[PDB]
Design a protein around this ligand. Sequence first.
Ligand SMILES: CNC(=O)c1cc(C(=O)N[C@H]2[C@@H]3COC[C@@H]32)cc2c1OC[C@@]2(C)c1ccccc1
Length: 110
Amino acid sequence: LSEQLKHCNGILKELLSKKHAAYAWPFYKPVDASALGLHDYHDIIKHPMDLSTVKRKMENRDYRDAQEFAADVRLMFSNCYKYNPPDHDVVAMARKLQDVFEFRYAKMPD
Ligand SMILES: CNC(=O)c1cc(C(=O)N[C@H]2[C@@H]3COC[C@@H]32)cc2c1OC[C@@]2(C)c1ccccc1
């Protein structure tokens, strides 16, 4: 990985770390719409994304730059904000994990 992609991988490891598990866990794996009874999920969310998918893409050297990695992380949060009512606990959790992401992503090495 390039320097910027190592910074992205560091962020990814932090997002998956025990430090943030209390609010990161809804984003660890793909939303299982059928299991959760969310039968409209895939009609509203056209491009599902989660941290396990981001990790697989990083491991596969799919991301060619930091911007591509950040786009998937933000897509994951955006899906949450689109589907979920703003007062659901999952939205509060998304906001908290996005704050961790955005503040560390901003410290990207030049
Ligand atoms: C990314 N995860 C989700 O969007 C998600 C979505 C829902 C969910 O049921 N959304 C429904 C919208 C539309 O109708 C009401 C709201 C539930 C969960 C999710 O994650 C994990 C889980 C199980 C959870 C999370 C935090 C607290 C408790 C339970």
